[PDB]
Amino acid sequence: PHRYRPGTVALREIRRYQKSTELLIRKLPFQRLVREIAQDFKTDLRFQSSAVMALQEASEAYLVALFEDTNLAAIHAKRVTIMPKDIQLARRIRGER
Amino acid sequence: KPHRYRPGTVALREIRRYQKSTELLIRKLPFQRLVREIAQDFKTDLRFQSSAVMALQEASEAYLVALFEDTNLAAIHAKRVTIMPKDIQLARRIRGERA
Amino acid sequence: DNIQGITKPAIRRLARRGGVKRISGLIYEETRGVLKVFLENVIRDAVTYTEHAKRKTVTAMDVVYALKRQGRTLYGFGG
Amino acid sequence: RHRKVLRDNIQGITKPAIRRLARRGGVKRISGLIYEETRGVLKVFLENVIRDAVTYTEHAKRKTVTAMDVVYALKRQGRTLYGFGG
Amino acid sequence: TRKESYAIYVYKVLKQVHPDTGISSKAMSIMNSFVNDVFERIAGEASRLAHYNKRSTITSREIQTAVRLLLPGELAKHAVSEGTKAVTKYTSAK
Amino acid sequence: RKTRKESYAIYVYKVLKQVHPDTGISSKAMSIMNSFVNDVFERIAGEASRLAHYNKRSTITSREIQTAVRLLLPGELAKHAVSEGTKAVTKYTSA
Amino acid sequence: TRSSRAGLQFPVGRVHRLLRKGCYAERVGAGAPVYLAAVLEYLTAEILELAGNAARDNKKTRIIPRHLQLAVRNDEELNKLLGRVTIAQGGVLPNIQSVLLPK
Amino acid sequence: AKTRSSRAGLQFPVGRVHRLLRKGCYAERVGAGAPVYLAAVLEYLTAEILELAGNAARDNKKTRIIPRHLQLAVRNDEELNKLLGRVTIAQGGVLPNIQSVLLPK
DNA sequence: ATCAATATCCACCTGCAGATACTACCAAAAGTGTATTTGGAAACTGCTCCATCAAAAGGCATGTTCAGCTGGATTCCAGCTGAACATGCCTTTTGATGGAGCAGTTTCCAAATACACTTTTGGTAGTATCTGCAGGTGGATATTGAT
DNA sequence: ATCAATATCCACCTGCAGATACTACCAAAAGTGTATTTGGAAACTGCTCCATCAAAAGGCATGTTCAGCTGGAATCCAGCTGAACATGCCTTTTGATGGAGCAGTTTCCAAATACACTTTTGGTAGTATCTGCAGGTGGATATTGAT
Ligand SMILES: [Cl-]
Ligand SMILES: [Cl-]
Ligand SMILES: [Cl-]
Ligand SMILES: [Cl-]
Ligand SMILES: [Mn+2]
Ligand SMILES: [Mn+2]
Ligand SMILES: [Mn+2]
Ligand SMILES: [Mn+2]
Ligand SMILES: [Mn+2]
Ligand SMILES: [Mn+2]
Ligand SMILES: [Mn+2]
Ligand SMILES: [Mn+2]
Ligand SMILES: [Mn+2]
Ligand SMILES: [Mn+2]
Ligand SMILES: [Mn+2]
Ligand SMILES: [Mn+2]
Ligand SMILES: [Mn+2]
Ligand SMILES: [Mn+2]
Ligand SMILES: [Mn+2]
Ligand SMILES: [Mn+2]
Ligand SMILES: [Mn+2]
Ligand SMILES: [Mn+2]
Ligand SMILES: [Mn+2]
Ligand SMILES: [Mn+2]
Ligand SMILES: [Mn+2]
Ligand SMILES: [Mn+2]
Ligand SMILES: [Mn+2]
Ligand SMILES: [Mn+2]
Ligand SMILES: [Mn+2]
Ligand SMILES: [Mn+2]
Ligand SMILES: [Mn+2]
Ligand SMILES: [Mn+2]
Ligand SMILES: [Mn+2]
Ligand SMILES: [Mn+2]
Ligand SMILES: [Mn+2]
Ligand SMILES: [Mn+2]
Ligand SMILES: [Mn+2]
C-alpha cells in the first residue's frame, strides 16, 4: 500500500491551513464552552450570534500566534516537536504567567 | 598554592549581591554621554535636566535587567547556563519587539 | 465535559496554521487550559460591560470592548 | 564657544557594567558575543524613548528635555515610570 | 506656581497603618505617581463606560464598574466595598 | 424610528474608487476598514488630548494632531501623513 | 462643504463634531479636524491600495478580509501600526520555519 | 462647615478628586458620588501598599520606607504585582531570585 | 533511473448569496451670519538650574594568564507520535416558532450646573533643629575547596 | 573529616543628608445657599433576532496498528569564559560661575464659542437586478516514495 512518510502530510496541512481563513474549531462545541464559562459570572445570559463569533475569532487568532511562538521555543531547544514547556516558556516571556 | 574559588562560585555571589541592592549598575557620566550623543543626532542644541537623564537610566537599567531574566530562561530552556545572542533574540521575538 | 469539546483534531489544525509540524501528546491538555484562561478573562470583562448596561444579552460590542481593554483589539464586529 | 564631538559613546556601556546587569537579572554565565548584542539592544531602546521625549520637548517649544518629557515618552511606550513626577 | 500632590494624604494613611514608620521623599514621590496613575486609569475606564452607554454623566456606578474592570480579584472586592460604604455614608449627611 | 448609526463606509468607498476604480469590497471587509478608521481616530485624538493637557492648553489645534501623528505613526507613514495633513490645511485656509 | 475646501473625501464636519463630543479638549481649533480627516484619508488609501493589489494578485476584483490581512502584514510599517490588532477572518501569512522542510 | 471627605469618613481629598475629574474631561457631567467613591478607592489602595511596604521596611530593620520597600511590597503581592505589571519603580531593584539549575552540586 | 499513487493546478461552468441600483422620507448634520467671549501669543524679565571648568584621588575598567567544566558534536535506540482506516457519533443546516428582551418613545423629578459670597487650607518660603541610617571598624562565624 | 583562606555577619559608632518643626502669607480651593436646567430612570411596547426542536446527512472525530525517525541519554574534548592580579585612568565629588532659557505677570487680537435660521445629507427602507466567485468536473502533470 501507498504510505506517505511521517511529516509529509503535516507540511501539507500547514500549507493548507496557512492559506485559508475559516475557523478551525467546530462552532457548537465552542459556543457551549463559552456559555458555561459565562454562566459562572452571571446566570441566564443570552449571547448575540456575532458576540460568540467575535470570541471564536479572537481565541483562534490568540492560539495561532501562541503556537507560532511555541514553535520558535521548541526550535530554540533544537527540537521540531512542541511540548508544554514550550507553551509555558512563550507565555512566561510574553508576561502572561 | 593560592586560593581560587571555582568557576561559577563568584558569579553566584554576584547575583545575590546585585539582586539585594538597588543602585544603578552603569557608570553615570558615561551613560549621560550616550544619551547626549543619541539625542544630538535627532535634534541639535538640546539641554537635559539632570533628572531627565536619571529617569532614562533607571528605565534603561530596568529594561535590560528584565530582558536578561527572560534571556536566562531562554538559555535554560535550551539546557544551557550560558546566555547567548540567540537567547536575547528569542526573548525579543516572543515579547513582540522583533520580527 | 465542555472544554473537552475542543478536540485534538481542531487543536492540531490551529497549531498547523501556526506552522507547527510535530505535536506532543501533552500539548492537547495544555492548550485547553490556556484557552480556558483566555476565555475567562475576556468573558469576565464582557459580562461586566453587560451587567453595567443592565442587559441580559452579551453583545458583540461587549466582547470587542473587553478585547480592547485586554490589549487584543479586534476588527470586524463593530470596532 | 563650541563643544566637543560626541562619538562611540555606546562603548561607555562597558563589559563589567553589562555583566552586573546580567547578574541582577539572575545570569550566571555570559557568552563573549553578549556584550555587543546588549549595546545594540540598549541603543535601540534609547533611540525610541529619546525620540519621543524630544518630540514632546519640541512640541512645547523648549530646548531642554525635562524629566516629564521622558516620563511621558516611557508611558506611551508602555513602560510607565514612577519616581520622577507625573 | 503651586503644584499639588497627594503627599499629606498619603502621610495620614501611613500614620494610620504604621504610626511609627516614616517615608523617604523618593518613596513619597513613587506614591504620588502611583495614586495619579490609578486615578487616570479608573477615570479613563469610567469615561469609556459612559460613552459606550451614551451617558454624559460619570457616576459612582461608572467608577464601580471601572474598578471591577481594572483591579484584580480581591483588590476589587475590597476597593468596591470601601467605595460604596463611603458613598452611603456621604449621602446620609446634611 | 431606528436610531441612525454613523460609519465611514461611504467615505471609505469613495477613496477606494480613486486608488482602484475597478475593485470592490465586501461588507465584512468594509466593517474592518471602519474599525480601522475609528481606532486611528481615537489613538490620535487621545495623544492630542494628552499633549494639550501636558502643556496646560485647552485647545486642540493642528499642531497637536501633527505631533500626535509623529508619535503614533512609524517613520515613513508619519512623514506622508504629516505631508497630507499640512497640504489639506493650507488648501483649506486659502479658500 | 469643508471637505471640498480641503480637497478631501473624508467628512471634515463629522470629524470636527466627533472631536468635541469626545471631550478631547475644552476647545477644538478649525484646522484640527482638517488635518485629522486628511490623515485618516491617507491611511485609508494606503491600505486599500495594498489590499487592492493583494486581491489582484489572487485574481479577484473584490477586497475581502484576507486581502486586508496580507496588505497589512506584508508591509513593515502598517504591520507595526497594527501589531496589537486582529483582523477577523484574515488568517496568517504563509510561513514555515526552514528546519521543518523536507530532507 | 465640614469637608466632603469627613462627611464620607475619608482621609483623601474629595474636593480635589471631584475637581480633577472635571478638568480631565472624562464626561460632560460628574455626579456627586463619583469623587467620593474614587477618593475611597485611592485611599484604600494607598493603605494596602503602605501596609505591605511598612512591613518590608520592618523586616529589613528600618523605620523609614524607601523605594526598595515599595518594590518588595508590590512584587511579593500577587495582585499588586499584576496591577503594576507594566510599571517600573525607580530605585526598587528586583526580587532575590536564582533559577535552580544554576545552583552548585 | 523507473514506475505507480496521490496530490495539485488550470480552464470552463453555474447557482446564488451578497453587492448594486433607484426612489422615497426626514431627523440630524452642516453651513452661513452675527455677536460676545477668550485662550494664549507677544513682551518683558525674574531667577532657576544647566553646562563648564578645576582639582584631587581612589574605585573600578583594562588586558593578561591559566585551566575548569560547559557547549557542541557523535552515536544510539527506545518509544512516542504521524499516517491510514474502519466506525458511527454528533455537528451542521434550516425552517419554523415562540417570545425574551433590546431598543425607541414620552414623562417628569432628583440631581447637576451656574453664580455669588465667605471661609479655609495646602503649597511656598525663610530659618532652625533633630535623626535614621550609610559607611567604616573589628572581631566572630559560616562557606568553600584542597587534601 | 581536617583545616585553611575568605567571604559574611553583625554589634558599635559617627557624621550628615534628609526629614521634621514653626511661623507667615495667600491665591486657589472648598463649602454654603439659591435658582434653573435636564439627564436618564421608569413604564410601555413594537419587533428584532435568540433559544429550541426537529431530523436527516455524512462530515469528521475516535480508537487502532504499525513503524519511521525524533528526542534524550551517554561520552568525549577543545577552547571559551570565569577567577584573580597588576596598573593606572577616568569617573565621582566638591565648588564656583556665567547666563541660557524656563517660567511668571500683563496686554491685547485673531479665533473659538454661542445662537438663529436655512439647506443639505447620510441612513434607513422597499423593491427589483446584477454579478464575482465558491464549489464542482475533467484532464493534465507535479510530487512522493517504493524498487
Ligand atoms: Cl513539557
Ligand atoms: Cl547565538
Ligand atoms: Cl487649528
Ligand atoms: Cl454619583
Ligand atoms: Mn552625532
Ligand atoms: Mn509514472
Ligand atoms: Mn497543469
Ligand atoms: Mn487544463
Ligand atoms: Mn486670558
Ligand atoms: Mn573619590
Ligand atoms: Mn588601564
Ligand atoms: Mn584543558
Ligand atoms: Mn554538557
Ligand atoms: Mn534512550
Ligand atoms: Mn489511501
Ligand atoms: Mn417583553
Ligand atoms: Mn431601554
Ligand atoms: Mn495649613
Ligand atoms: Mn551598614
Ligand atoms: Mn573587618
Ligand atoms: Mn561579635
Ligand atoms: Mn552621613
Ligand atoms: Mn524648631
Ligand atoms: Mn430630557
Ligand atoms: Mn414614569
Ligand atoms: Mn469508535
Ligand atoms: Mn523500532
Ligand atoms: Mn536527534
Ligand atoms: Mn524517550
Ligand atoms: Mn568548542
Ligand atoms: Mn585573593
Ligand atoms: Mn535670556
Ligand atoms: Mn502686548
Ligand atoms: Mn442622499
Ligand atoms: Mn430595479
Ligand atoms: Mn474554485
Ligand atoms: Mn479530475
Encoded amino acid at B66, one letter: A
Task: Say which nucleotide is closest to residue A85, CA to C1' distance.
Answer: J71
Return the CATH number of the domain spanning residue range H1-105.
1.10.20.10
Domain boundaries, chain H: 1-105
Directed axis angle between helix F9-19 and helix G31-56, to 10°? 60
Q: How far is the CA of A16 from the centre of ligand 37 (A)?
A: 19
Chains that touch H (3 or more CB pairs under 8 A): B, D, E, G
- DSSP bridge partners of A46: C57
Interface test with C, best of F5, F12, F26, F31 (most C CBs within 10 A): F31
State the ligand closest to the CA atom of A3.
15
- DSSP bridge partners of B47: D64
Q: What is the CATH number of the domain that holds B28?
A: 1.10.20.10
Q: Which nucleotides of I are covered by protein (CB under 7 A)?
A: 5-8, 18-20, 28-31, 39-40, 49-52, 60-62, 68-72, 80-85, 90-92, 100-105, 111-113, 119-124, 132-134, 144-147
Q: Which three cell numbers stand for residue A82?
A: 512542541
Q: Which three cell numbers stand for residue D36?
A: 555587543
- Burial class, A42, CB count within 10 angstroms (exposed 0-12 / middle 13-18 / buried 19+): middle
Touching status, chains E and D (3+ beta-carbon pairs under 8 Å) = yes
Specify whether domain D1-86 bears CATH 1.10.20.10. Answer: yes
Cβ A29 to strand I below 7 Å: yes
Task: State which fold the G1-103 domain adopts.
Answer: Histone, subunit A (1.10.20)
Alpha helices (H) in C1-79, listed in sequence order: 8-17, 27-52, 60-69
Measured in residues, chain B has a length of 99
Alpha-carbon distance values, B28 to D7, D14, E54, F61 (Å): 17, 12, 52, 39
Smallest CA–CA distance from D77 into chain H, residue: H86
- Which G residues 33-62 have CB within 7 Å of strand I? 62
- DSSP bridge partners of A47: C58
Helix (H, G, I), strand (E, B) or coil at C52: helix
Smallest CA–CA distance from F71 into chain G, residue: G81
Whether residues E86 and H49 touch (CB distance < 8 A) is answered with no
Q: How far is the CA of H104 from the centre of ligand 8 (A)?
A: 69
With CA atoms as reference, report the closest residue to G39 among G17, G58, G64, G12: G12
CB crowding H57-77: b at 16 or more within 10 Å, else e: beeeebeebbbbbbbbbbbeb
Q: Which residues, other chains included, contact A28 with Cβ-Cβ below 8 Å and sequence gap of 6+?
A: C5
C-alpha R_g of chain G: 19
Cα–Cα distance measured from residue A70 to residue A88, given in angstroms and rounded to the nearest whole number = 8
- The alpha carbon dihedral of H33, H35, H41, H46 has a sign of negative
Cα–Cα distance measured from residue D68 to residue D61, given in angstroms and rounded to the nearest whole number = 14
Alpha helices (H) in chain A, listed in sequence order: 8-19, 27-39, 49-76, 84-94
CB crowding D15-25: b at 16 or more within 10 Å, else e: eebbbbbbbbb
Cβ G21 to strand I below 7 Å: no
Domains and CATH numbers, chain F: 1-95 (1.10.20.10)
Experimental technique used? X-ray
Residue with cell 509529509: A8
Measured in residues, chain H has a length of 105
Task: Say which nucleotide is closest to residue A46, CA to C1' distance.
Answer: J50
Q: Domain range spanning residue A32?
A: 1-97
Encoded amino acid at E76, one letter: A
- The two beta strands, E57-58 and A81-82, are unpaired
Alpha-carbon distance values, F31 to C69, E48, F27, G66 (Å): 20, 21, 6, 13
Q: What is the number of domains present in chain A?
A: 1
C-alpha R_g of chain F: 16
**Min Cα separation H35/chain B (Å):** 32
Strands, E, within chain F: which ranges? 24-25, 59-60
Q: Phi and psi (nearest 5°) for A82?
A: -80, 145
Interface test with A, best of B90, B92, B93, B98 (most A CBs within 10 A): B90
Neighbours of H85 (CB within 10 A): 11
Task: State which fold the C1-79 domain adopts.
Answer: Histone, subunit A (1.10.20)
